[PDB]
């Protein structure tokens, strides 16, 4: 799924605790609202623990 | 040298050689990811271009 031409809102992503893994490789998630990117992609699949 | 904190000023030379942090997080003076050696060697061949 391709997501673009919208204001990125990661505020609800780190303000929840239902997730188990929030490791961000390459870039630091402490500064995300101040970063400007061109393309944002999101994959989805289900795997065992 | 391949890495320099900022742009160098005219008629200036620098001697210091230490691992150059090139990431959001520092590697704190040991060899690893997001830091490399600014000083790297030349390679030549007798039959090169």
């Amino acid at each position, epitope marked *: 799924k391709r997501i673009s031409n919208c204001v990125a809102d990661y505020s609800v992503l780190y*303000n929840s*605790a239902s997730f188990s893994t*929030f490791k961000c490789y390459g870039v630091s998630p*402490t500064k995300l609202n101040d970063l400007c990117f061109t393309n944002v992609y999101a994959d989805s699949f289900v795997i065992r623990g | 040298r391949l890495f320099r904190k900022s742009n160098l000023k005219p008629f200036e030379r620098d001697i210091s050689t230490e691992i150059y942090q090139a990431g*959001s997080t520092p*590697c*704190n003076g*040991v060899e690893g990811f997001n830091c490399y050696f600014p000083l790297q060697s030349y390679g030549f061949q007798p039959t090169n271009g």
Partner: antibody
Amino acid sequence: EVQLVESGGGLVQPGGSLRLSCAASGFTFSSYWMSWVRQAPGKGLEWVANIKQDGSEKYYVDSVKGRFTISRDNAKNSLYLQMNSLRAEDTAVYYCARGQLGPWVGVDYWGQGTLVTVS
Amino acid sequence: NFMLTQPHSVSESPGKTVTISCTGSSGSIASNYVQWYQQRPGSAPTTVIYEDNQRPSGVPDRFSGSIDSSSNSASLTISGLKTEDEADYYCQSYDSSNWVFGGGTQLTVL
């Protein structure tokens, strides 16, 4: 600069009720995570509870489950820690912990705390 | 039953680079971020390493952090070994809806 003031202890009570309050200033109280951390005198650190920015979700450890509670408000910028049915293990110093984006980034905030002993 | 195993009395050395190892057993510590904190005895604690590789502003450039996924351990090394106040250090990780603290590593003789 962020100032954290804690004054909720100073008396001994077996199995009673005690209310602790942490005062915070210098930052917005309704956009980060708060938590609470205690440690025994002469022993290691341990975790107590973590609080969302609106108080919708609260969690504690399994050793204190069933008891323990937390409440918050953004109008007065204060945290309320109520206790019930204390034991002898509860001799600890309590710091009101504050987060930045979530509970994976780190704590990085610890008040001076208040001595809390039971007898 | 996530727990972090680390020693209690290391780094008793003058002025060189020594390492402190923090490892877990129930799960992989490389899945979530692991941090390092320092506690002044009789005073408020502070944090030396956050985001598993970064230091806060004002922290000196000497304390190092690294992650080894082969041994499932996290390494904290200090380079300068200056006249810092005696303290103890702890390890933190995240399994599910909970926080886990380390045992503690005393460092008094520098």
